[PDB]
Ligand binder design. Structure first.
Ligand SMILES: [Cl-]
Ligand SMILES: [Cl-]
Length: 129
């Protein structure tokens, strides 16, 4: 599913990401824009051979099991394919674990390089929340 910007914002807010660990909803929408273009089906190989899955590009080295990543820890205890569903529940629950890993949203290099230090509130402008 390709979410609208505010449609994703509303889903993330419902699932409790708004201000989760101090990260405002605009941070999560900004990250999803640049990780997946709001597309739950997005998949992308990483340099280390793992693959990133779903709206927030959750990787198969630490977080989900894709059957083809040596060293997979599957800390979210989920097949990576479940992160591609039109329902973002699994991606949100796993992202809450990722953002708790010590590095906050710097766990997503795209957030660090494209969202951090910008006007991320702009990503929820016009949203009816
Ligand atoms: Cl590739
Ligand atoms: Cl930095």
């Amino acid at each position: 599913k390709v979410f609208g910007r505010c449609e994703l914002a509303a889903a993330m807010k419902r699932h409790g990401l708004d201000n989760y660990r101090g990260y405002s909803l605009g941070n999560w929408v900004c990250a999803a824009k640049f990780e997946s273009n709001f597309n739950t089906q997005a998949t992308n190989r990483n340099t280390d051979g793992s693959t990133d899955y779903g709206i927030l590009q959750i990787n198969s080295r630490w977080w989900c099991n894709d059957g083809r990543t040596p060293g997979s820890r599957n800390l979210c205890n989920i097949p990576c394919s479940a992160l591609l569903s039109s329902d973002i529940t699994a991606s949100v629950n796993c992202a809450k674990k990722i953002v708790s890993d010590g590095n906050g949203m710097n766990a997503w290099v795209a957030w660090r390089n494209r969202c951090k230090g910008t006007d991320v509130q702009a990503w929820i402008r016009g949203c009816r929340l």
